[PDB]
């Protein structure tokens, strides 16, 4: 197995997936590295499983029709894993964690949100449909863009919103259009 956390690139107290070379801090893993399961699979195996039971799942989707599906176990996995493969970019680090806005000219948005919030939502189950996680998503993106104005770290905003969006059409087979 690899010797550094897939998501965060570090050392450290590593889980070692059965089925592939890659390891996980517990809480770096989504969800969290589980007590016991001998053997145990990373989400990167547990995708790759639902994509070969049903090798149909790759074909192009509608987003309309992703967006309203309801949450039920592989739904829930696939966020799962959308929301590690933006955790896995270290630019993240900037969306992490509760923001605050003091900046002269700027006024805050008027929901506030971040990745460590939808960690927790989609750990507590608040979601019923995939538009529910998507969308919270997206906002944490266009929030930072909105409050950042002409200032040049409106970009990394666009650059973490481009990761999301790629996974996004990965992990949910849309159907790609020029
Ligand atoms: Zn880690
Ligand atoms: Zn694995
Ligand atoms: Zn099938």
Same mark, same amino acid.
């Given at each position: ?5 897939? $998501? ?37 195996? /547990? ?14 989707? @509608? ?46 948005? @008027? ?6 919030? $939808? ?9 019923? /449909?995939?538009?529910?996680? $998507? ?19 409106? /970009?990394?905003?666009?650059? $973490? ?13 849309? @159907?790609?259009?020029?």
């Amino acid at each position: 197995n690899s010797n550094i956390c897939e $998501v965060c690139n570090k050392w450290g107290r590593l889980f070692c997936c059965d089925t592939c070379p890659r390891s996980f801090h517990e809480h770096c893993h989504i969800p969290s590295v589980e007590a016991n399961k001998n053997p145990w699979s990373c989400i990167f195996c /547990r995708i790759k499983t639902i994509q070969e039971r049903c090798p149909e799942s790759q074909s192009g989707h @509608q987003e309309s029709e992703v967006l309203m599906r309801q949450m039920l176990p592989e739904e829930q996995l696939k966020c799962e894993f959308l929301l590690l493969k933006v955790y896995c970019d270290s630019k993240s680090c900037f969306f992490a964690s509760e923001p605050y806005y003091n900046r002269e000219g700027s006024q805050g948005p @008027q929901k506030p949100m971040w990745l460590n919030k $939808v960690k927790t939502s989609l750990n507590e189950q608040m979601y019923t /449909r995939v538009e529910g996680f $998507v969308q919270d998503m997206r906002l944490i993106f266009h929030n930072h863009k909105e409050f950042y104005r002409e200032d040049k770290f409106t /970009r990394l905003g666009i650059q $973490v919103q481009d990761i999301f969006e790629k996974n996004f059409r990965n992990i949910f087979a849309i @159907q790609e259009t020029s």
